[model samples]
Target: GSSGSSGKVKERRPFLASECTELPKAEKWRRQIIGEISKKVAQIQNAGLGEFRIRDLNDEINKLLREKGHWEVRIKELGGPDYGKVSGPSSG
Candidate 1:
C-alpha cells in the first residue's frame, strides 16, 4: 500500500452555469417567504406608523438579520468560500 498526505475537501456551488435550470425546491420556498415579507412591508410603507405594527416589523426584521449573521459565521467555520460577489444556496 502507498501512503501520501491527504488534504481536506469541501462542498461548493458554482457561481455561474452553462445550462438553464430550475431553482432548487428549498430555495424556492425561501424566496416565497422573503417575497411575502416584502409585500407586508410595502403594504405598511406609507401608512401612519403605529406602535404595534412598528414593533412587530422591528422584531421580525431583527430575527432575519440575526439569522443572516449566523450563516456568515457558519460558512467561515465550515471552510467555505469567503463572502464576495454572490452568496446563498445552490441555484439549481
Candidate 2:
C-alpha cells in the first residue's frame, strides 16, 4: 500500500432542486441525503481499494440509503414522483 495520498471524495446535488416554497419538506431532505450518498459512492473508490476502507464506506452509505428511503416514502405520500434519483451525466 502507498502512503501520502491526498485524493478526496466529491458529491454533487442541487439544494432546493425545485422551488423551495413549493417542494415538500421530505423531498428537500431526500435530495440532501442523495448528495451524501453520492459522496459515499466516490469515497468508496477513493478508499484506494483497501478492504477495510471500502467496507467502511459501505456501512456509511447503507445508513444514508435507509434515511434516503425513509424520506422517499414521505415524498411519495406527498405526491412526489416515484422515479427519484439525483444522479446525472458529469462533464469531467
Candidate 3:
C-alpha cells in the first residue's frame, strides 16, 4: 500500500545486472560485489558456502568489490599511481 510518495518503493530481488543499475550509488557497490563473488563461487563450486554466515560474507565481499571497482575506474581516469616510480636513499 502506498503511504506517501516516499513510502516503500519496491526493490528488485535476486538482483540482475539491469536491476542493479537502478540502485543508489552506495548500495549499488555492494550489489555489484555480491554478484562478482557469486560468480566466482559458482565457478569454483565452493560447497562450504551453503551456510547462512557464508552467504552473508559473500554478499559483503561482492559489495566491497563493486565499490572497489568504481574507485579504481575513477583513479585510472585521473592517471593511477605510478608503481614504476623508483625511490633512492636520501641523506640522513
Indicate which candidate wins on lDDT: 2
Q: Give per-residue CA lDDT, model 1, range 3-71, as digits (tens).
A: 787658853433222111323422333343455567667646855678788777766765544443434
Off by over 4 Å in 2: 1-23, 47-49, 83-92
Which ten-residue region of model 3 has the weakest summed lDDT? 83-92
lDDT of 3 at 64: 52
Report every candidate's CA lDDT.
Answer: 0.46, 0.64, 0.46
Return the TM-score for each candidate structure: 0.39, 0.55, 0.34
Greater-TM-score candidate between 1 and 2: 2
lDDT of 3 by residue, 1-92 (tens): 75556556864343333333332332434444556676666634665656775667666666655554443333333354311122233211
Per-residue accuracy of model 2 over 15-89 as CA lDDT, tens digit each: 433333334666667778888899889978686878988998899898887776556554554677642343233
Checking candidate 1 for backbone clashes, the offending pairs are none
Q: Which order, best to worst by TM-score?
A: 2, 1, 3
How far does residue 19 in candidate 1 sit from its true spot (Å)? Answer: 33
Q: What is the number of backbone collisions in each predicted candidate, taken in the order shown?
A: 0, 0, 4
lDDT of model 3, residue 76: 33
What stretches of model 1 exceed 4 Å from their correct place? 1-49, 84-92
Model 3: residue 10 alpha-carbon error in angstroms: 36
